[PDB]
Amino acid sequence: SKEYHIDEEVGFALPNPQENLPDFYNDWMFIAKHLPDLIESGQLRERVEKLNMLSIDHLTDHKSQRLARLVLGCITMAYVWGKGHGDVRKVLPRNIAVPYCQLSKKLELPPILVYADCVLANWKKKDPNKPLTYENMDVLFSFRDGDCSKGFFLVSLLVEIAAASAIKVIPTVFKAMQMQERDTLLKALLEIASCLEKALQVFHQIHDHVNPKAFFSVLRIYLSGWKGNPQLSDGLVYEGFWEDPKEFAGGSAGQSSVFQCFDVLLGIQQTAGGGHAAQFLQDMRRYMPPAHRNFLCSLESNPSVREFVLSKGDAGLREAYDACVKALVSLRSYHLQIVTKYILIPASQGGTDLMNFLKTVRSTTEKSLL
Ligand code: HEM
Numbered sequence: 566s567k568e569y570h571i572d573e574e575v576g577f578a579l580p581n582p583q584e585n586l587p588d589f590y591n592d593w594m595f596i597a598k599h600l601p602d603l604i605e606s607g608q609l610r611e612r613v614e615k616l617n618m619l620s621i622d623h624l625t626d627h628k629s630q631r632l633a634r635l636v637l638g639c640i641t642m643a644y645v646w647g648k649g650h651g652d653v654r655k656v657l658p659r660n661i662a663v664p665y666c667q668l669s670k671k672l673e674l675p676p677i678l679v680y681a682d683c684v685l686a687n688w689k690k691k692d693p694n695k696p697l698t699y700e701n702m703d704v705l706f707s708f709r710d711g712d713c714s715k716g717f718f719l720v721s722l723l724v725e726i727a728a729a730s731a732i733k734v735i736p737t738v739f740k741a742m743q744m745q746e747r748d749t750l751l752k753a754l755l756e757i758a759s760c761l762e763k764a765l766q767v768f769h770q771i772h773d774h775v776n777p778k779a780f781f782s783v784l785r786i787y788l789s790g791w792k793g794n795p796q797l798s799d800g801l802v803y804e805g806f807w808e809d810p811k812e813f814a815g816g817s818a819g820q821s822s823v824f825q826c827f828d829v830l831l832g833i834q835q836t837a838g839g840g841h842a843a844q845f846l847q848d849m850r851r852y853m854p855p856a857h858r859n860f861l862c863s864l865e866s867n868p869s870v871r872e873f874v875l876s877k878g879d880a881g882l883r884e885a886y887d888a889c890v891k892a893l894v895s896l897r898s899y900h901l902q903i904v905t906k907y908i909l910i911p912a913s914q915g916g917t918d919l920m921n922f923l924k925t926v927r928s929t930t931e932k933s934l935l
């Protein structure tokens with residue numbers, strides 16, 4: 566894979582993200598690094614309004630442009646949502662809104678915190694020479710002490726890395742169909758099934774690092790967006806870049822490239838049929854980095870793996886293909902159980918529209934079995 570910014574170790578995640586910005590930008594990173602205390606102390610909003618307008622021209626390489634986008638997205642969430650108790654600011658000041666909207670046009674991402682910010686660019690190893698495990702990793706930014714953003718972001722990142730071993734198999738799946746190598750195709754499919762089955766275990770780690778009350782009452786408050794949100798019904802005003810208020814969706818793992826890429830690989834048409842779920846997954850492609858959007862489009866341009874396997878009357882191929890579909894179904898069923906524990910039950914102590922979305926996506930997956 567060429568310039569799709571896919572890493573063979575960490576997949577769609579940004580490999581070894583930049584931790585520090587140039588000194589020109591320490592006014593940005595002091596705030597971001599101290600969001601827990603600046604929010605709690607009611608000082609955060611005022612330091613945002615205190616800030617001088619910086620130019621983005623001192624951010625040279627790709628990693629610093631991404632880190633900065635992470636820094637400014639977290640400051641926007643903090644500023645818009647404050648202490649997370651419902652008192653909203655509906656205008657984001659220009660000394661932050663202009664350089665944030667400038668950088669996002671530069672990266673073809675919307676000016677809100679997305680999955681590629683706080684999951685794919687929001688990590689480090691503790692010791693660079695020890696492996697990629699929860700114990701040797703940390704996030705770079707959080708919102709409030711005890712918000713479990715470390716557990717939530719890291720475990721998701723760990724699933725993205727576990728899926729990377731399946732992604733590197735994709736080129737051989739398509740070459741084997743073209744070159745008509747049935748034995749190679751069968752083994753490439755069983756290899757993809759194994760990786761996705763191993764990713765189900767990584768999901769299990771969520772129960773040890775995220776708490777249902779902290780997730781529902783704090784973390785998701787700060788990840789919320791302003792599209793269809795009654796708290797900013799007309800969207801957010803970006804000071805001195807648009808005079809109208811503009812609506813952007815909160816961050817979602819519907820923005821993850823990795824479950825979309827296996828739906829496309831296996832010919833599961835998650836984006837067909839005109840339902841709300843198909844609509845949401847298409848739109849969330851604009852919230853992915855353009856390189857990964859480009860990868861998904863190129864995947865769709867390749868001949869259907871499902872059609873090829875259906876065409877050949879080969880029980881061995883049919884069962885290797887079904888092994889991947891079942892492994893996708895298993896991930897989405899366990900995930901649904903996670904949502905029942907971390908959203909449905911807390912909300913009982915709204916939640917039904919998102920579960921019908923996830924049930925629609927799971928059932929679509931399930932109906933691709935042969
Ligand atoms: C506390 C744990 C979790 C909760 C409460 C949760 C909740 C949700 C919700 C409400 C949605 C649908 C709306 C939205 O996208 O924002 C969703 C979608 C999604 N989530 Fe999570 N999630 C959790 C953990 C994870 C983990 C660890 C992953 C691994 C990467 C993940 C991957 C996904 C994916 C891929 C989707 C898109 C729908 C699909 O492909 O089936 N989630 N999640």
Ligand SMILES: N#Cc1ccc(NC(=O)NCc2cnc3scc(C#CC4CC4)n23)cc1
Pocket residue numbers: 678679680681683684717718721785788815816817818819908912915916919
């Ligand atoms: N009531 C309620 C209610 C509660 C939560 C949500 N949505 C939500 O948290 N989406 C993000 C998400 C879903 N799954 C996963 S894994 C890693 C991430 C992430 C992230 C940062 C945001 C980019 N995500 C909707 C409604």
